Design a protein around this nucleic acid. Structure first.
Ligand SMILES: [K+]
Ligand SMILES: [K+]
Ligand SMILES: [K+]
Ligand SMILES: [Mg+2]
Ligand SMILES: [Mg+2]
Ligand SMILES: [Mg+2]
Ligand SMILES: [Mg+2]
Ligand SMILES: [Mg+2]
Ligand SMILES: [Mg+2]
Ligand SMILES: [Mg+2]
Ligand SMILES: [Mg+2]
Ligand SMILES: [Mg+2]
Ligand SMILES: [Mg+2]
Ligand SMILES: [Mg+2]
Ligand SMILES: [Mg+2]
Ligand SMILES: [Mg+2]
Ligand SMILES: [Mg+2]
Ligand SMILES: [Mg+2]
Ligand SMILES: [Mg+2]
Ligand SMILES: [Mg+2]
Ligand SMILES: [Mg+2]
Ligand SMILES: [Mg+2]
Ligand SMILES: [Mg+2]
Ligand SMILES: [Mg+2]
Ligand SMILES: [Mg+2]
Ligand SMILES: [Mg+2]
Ligand SMILES: [Mg+2]
Ligand SMILES: [Mg+2]
Ligand SMILES: [Mg+2]
Ligand SMILES: [Mg+2]
Ligand SMILES: [Mg+2]
Ligand SMILES: [Mg+2]
Ligand SMILES: [Mg+2]
Ligand SMILES: [Mg+2]
Ligand SMILES: [Mg+2]
Ligand SMILES: [Mg+2]
Ligand SMILES: [Mg+2]
Ligand SMILES: [Mg+2]
Ligand SMILES: [Mg+2]
Ligand code: NA
Ligand code: NA
Ligand code: NA
Ligand code: NA
Ligand code: NA
Lengths: 101, 118, 50
RNA sequence: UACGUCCCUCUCCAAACGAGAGAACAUGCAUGGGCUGGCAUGAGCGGCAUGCUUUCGGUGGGGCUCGUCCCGAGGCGCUGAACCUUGAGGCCUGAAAUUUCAUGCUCAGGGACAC
RNA sequence: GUGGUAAUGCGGCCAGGUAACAAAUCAAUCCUCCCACGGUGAGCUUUCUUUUCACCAUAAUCCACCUUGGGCCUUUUUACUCUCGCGUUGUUCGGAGCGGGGGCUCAAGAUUGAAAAAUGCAUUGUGAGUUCUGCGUUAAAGCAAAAACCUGGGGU
RNA sequence: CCAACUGCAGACCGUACUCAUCACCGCAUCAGGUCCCCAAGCAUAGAAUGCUCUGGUACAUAGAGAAAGGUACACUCAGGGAAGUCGGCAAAAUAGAUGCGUAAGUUCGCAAGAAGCAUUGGCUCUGAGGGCAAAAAUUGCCAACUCAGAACUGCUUACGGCGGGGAAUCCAACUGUAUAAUUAAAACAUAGGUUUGU
RNA sequence: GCAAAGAUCUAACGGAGAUAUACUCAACAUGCAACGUUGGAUACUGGAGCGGGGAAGGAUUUCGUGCCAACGGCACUCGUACACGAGUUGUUCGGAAACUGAGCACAACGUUAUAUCGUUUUGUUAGGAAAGUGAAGGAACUGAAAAGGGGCAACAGAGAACCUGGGAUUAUAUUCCAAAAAGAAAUUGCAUGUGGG
RNA sequence: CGGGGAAACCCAGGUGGAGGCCUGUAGCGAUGCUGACGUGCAAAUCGCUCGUAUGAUUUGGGUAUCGGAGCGAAAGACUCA
């Protein structure tokens, strides 16, 4: 009992990677009976095959750190690795200021 | 952004308010109560206590009003609240009661919610 | 790749058509000396280079 | 024939593997507890209060709301606390102790030689 | 054929043009990422968490017609009289016509609508990247050509 | 006459798959070689490097497991500090950013990151640097991050990544090139100089 | 010796691949080790990717079912293996019809005992007469002017009228979809009408 | 553009981005370990280290010049191990 064909067809139909396709470990005869794209679509409609949600990559830590940085943290002398011109080019500052004036 | 934020300012947060208030959010509990509850009073008490206004739990004033009419629940407020927030509060409630594994909640329409089953 | 002259495609087609085993009834015949095609070709063993 | 020996099994003064030292229902093994030691005061909560300690004593540069209650690195208290402590393999169930160990697993050992 | 003072608008042969061209700078189109707000679904929920994650799409081809930049016309042209003015981040520019007013035109985009919701999946604003495009220094180095196509000059 | 419809008709060949730690070349499913496009989040100067959502993968013979002796894109070491060695080979060392400071020599360009000295965390704040609109030197709204300066409070000096430095002598001016598979150099080239033929 | 590229674990299912036994024997001490799939866990690649598409090269390795003799330096129930049966759809995509480039060299001429040699784009072959038809004029027959023959060489230069949706495959797709073409276009070549000033 | 200067000119600060310029990716190479390996992964590879990285730079395709010969920034290098 190999469900490689059904998994391949389900990944094609659902528009997702193999890791997000869920094939019911129970109900294996019903999935194995599905040899066409139409029958795999029927399996997806019956809940036998499910697209799983993507994993979480959360930006909450970065948002909190961005609030801290906006208040003025983490940007002192010990923190900066690039040259001052790299961090804030002198040409950009000059262009800004002359356009202002 | 325009003005630099402060940590002390984070102490007390002020919630934006709209123009013509009395904005209404409704939860519809008809289906779960149709089944075999004294749980509508539970939900109303939960929303009276654990609902946050200006960053504080409770003390809603005239701004947020909760009523339970005809086996459903209406929420009327003059603050800029998101519907997803009262959905979040409902999901917390159902996580307390252990119903969340059984009661689901969906947008039945614009401005209202509905408790359904699986 | 995608490109090939039709003549090269026809030569490759003929080579595909030739890459078949011997029918068994050929082995049942009266003076038969053939049992394997002996000119079978695998794409990984030997190249045609058309 | 009988004594017995080896393998399986268990321990580690032995050890590349053989070999060795041992044990053979044995506090033997396991898990706890205590000791001995290592690190350095856990999570949680809290600020003259139903908290901490035994009548005492109890923050913070600043900041934000409406005297109060909030945000705030760090600090203080409960708290020499929390965790780790035999395992390639520390101690105690056999001196005494303000405590000085407790439990539970084993239920005809199996196999081959001796023959 | 025809209108506008004009810039220019509208219904054999010959000579030009497109094709057609190294670089940098600074703005940048789509597009990508982020943030704000608002919907839809999902996740966490011992305790916190107005939360975390996902999604919120609009192809070619057409019609109409609110900015940026370039070229130009016309008009004022005592514009540069002894510190001329305009403009770029930047190396400039002007009686061989600057600047102002009013227009013509080209190139990029906007906006309106047709397509188009009948489709798709289960939203409308900002900040960073990004060379389509716009802005038409090394050189004893100056950075292909042709077909095809376009327009005129003459003639019917 | 021909400028908008409309009617009919639009022929040929290619098209699977692969493009590589298994599809090509290297006798092979070989740690070698092989052109092009699209290219996400956080740290950060970043296509460095480290980790991660989407996509992809768990394929490379494995199990048990402290001998000696090895190999390592693995470490440490009291006291001394090159005494080792042909030779500091190897390893150690230096390190980012910012301010200050910097000799001889010199073709005036450099030498130079010369040498050296110092500072950088975390929190809570303060200042400066703008755009839009109706003595406008003011009145509202608003966005993006940087730089500076304080108080308080820490350090076990603590990811990655990241120059050691100086005094002289020989040679070649310099950047280049070059013995594919033992030689990268002082060799070749070079600009510059001279000569010859015409 | 099969040690670079970190790595697998767990259950259930499938499978001949097992829980496979002389007496005694309850099970350990007498069937070990290994598989493919799904679910879950853990990790890696880390966008200069064991991602998604192309050229060269390869040519069926693609897809489905089946099968494990040999091959996949261990293993296999698995396979780029083997057997059977399939699969590549175009007015517009790429090429060619139909451009020029570095270049090539048919003709021509010359040379050579020998063409199997040379010249052949510095506007251009050859001592070199290399043009074969717009017109007219009474339906195909006749003919002006025009200098320098015929080709080839780019699948990244020039050139080139299509693009979204699909519940549309086992495998192809800007190629397939059928009158509500899901549909919306653009563009050739001929013909038919409407209208013209 | 600011300051000096009788004049010639001098002293500052900004702008701008030159270079067979430097550090450093990819790329292109290959210094040392005289490391690994040396019946190899490999009839030249692997690791770390190292040179260069806007140029006399690297690279695809096409095209031209060869055996008493071609080509060569010259090593008798290279011309399908
Ligand atoms: K070969
Ligand atoms: K070990
Ligand atoms: K160590
Ligand atoms: Mg500058
Ligand atoms: Mg071929
Ligand atoms: Mg042992
Ligand atoms: Mg005792
Ligand atoms: Mg294809
Ligand atoms: Mg590829
Ligand atoms: Mg990176
Ligand atoms: Mg990288
Ligand atoms: Mg492998
Ligand atoms: Mg191996
Ligand atoms: Mg030492
Ligand atoms: Mg020491
Ligand atoms: Mg010595
Ligand atoms: Mg000595
Ligand atoms: Mg060294
Ligand atoms: Mg000096
Ligand atoms: Mg020096
Ligand atoms: Mg220094
Ligand atoms: Mg030299
Ligand atoms: Mg030399
Ligand atoms: Mg010299
Ligand atoms: Mg150089
Ligand atoms: Mg050099
Ligand atoms: Mg050599
Ligand atoms: Mg020389
Ligand atoms: Mg062996
Ligand atoms: Mg990973
Ligand atoms: Mg890749
Ligand atoms: Mg094998
Ligand atoms: Mg086959
Ligand atoms: Mg030519
Ligand atoms: Mg051609
Ligand atoms: Mg085409
Ligand atoms: Mg350089
Ligand atoms: Mg060596
Ligand atoms: Mg020599
Ligand atoms: Na290819
Ligand atoms: Na390989
Ligand atoms: Na091994
Ligand atoms: Na076949
Ligand atoms: Na540096």
């Amino acid at each position: 009992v190999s469900l490689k064909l059904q998994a391949r067809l389900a990944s094609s139909i659902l528009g997702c990677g193999r890791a997000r396709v869920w094939l019911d470990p129970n109900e294996a005869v019903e999935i194995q009976n599905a040899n066409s794209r139409k029958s795999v679509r029927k399996l997806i409609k019956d809940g036998f095959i499910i697209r799983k949600p993507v994993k979480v990559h959360s930006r909450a830590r970065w948002r909190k750190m961005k609030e801290a940085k906006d208040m003025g943290r983490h940007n002192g002398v010990g923190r900066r690795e690039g040259s001052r011109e790299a961090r804030m080019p002198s040409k950009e500052l000059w262009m800004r200021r002359l356009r202002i004036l | 952004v325009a003005v630099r934020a402060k940590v002390g300012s984070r102490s007390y947060v002020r919630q934006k308010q709209l123009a013509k208030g009395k904005k209404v959010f409704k939860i519809d509990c008809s289906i779960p109560a149709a089944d075999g509850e004294d749980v509508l009073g539970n939900f109303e008490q939960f929303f009276q206590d654990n609902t946050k206004l200006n960053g504080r739990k409770g003390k809603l004033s005239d701004k947020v009003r909760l009523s339970m009419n005809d086996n459903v629940l209406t929420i009327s407020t003059t603050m800029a609240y998101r519907k997803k927030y009262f959905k979040y509060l409902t999901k917390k409630f159902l996580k307390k009661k252990d119903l969340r594994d059984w009661i689901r909640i969906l947008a039945t329409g614009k401005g209202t919610y509905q408790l359904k089953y699986f | 790749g995608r490109f090939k002259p039709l003549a090269v495609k026809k030569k490759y087609a003929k080579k595909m058509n030739q890459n078949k085993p011997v029918p068994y009834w050929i082995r049942l015949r009266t003076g038969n000396r053939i049992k394997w095609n002996e000119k079978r070709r695998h794409w990984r063993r030997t190249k045609l280079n058309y």
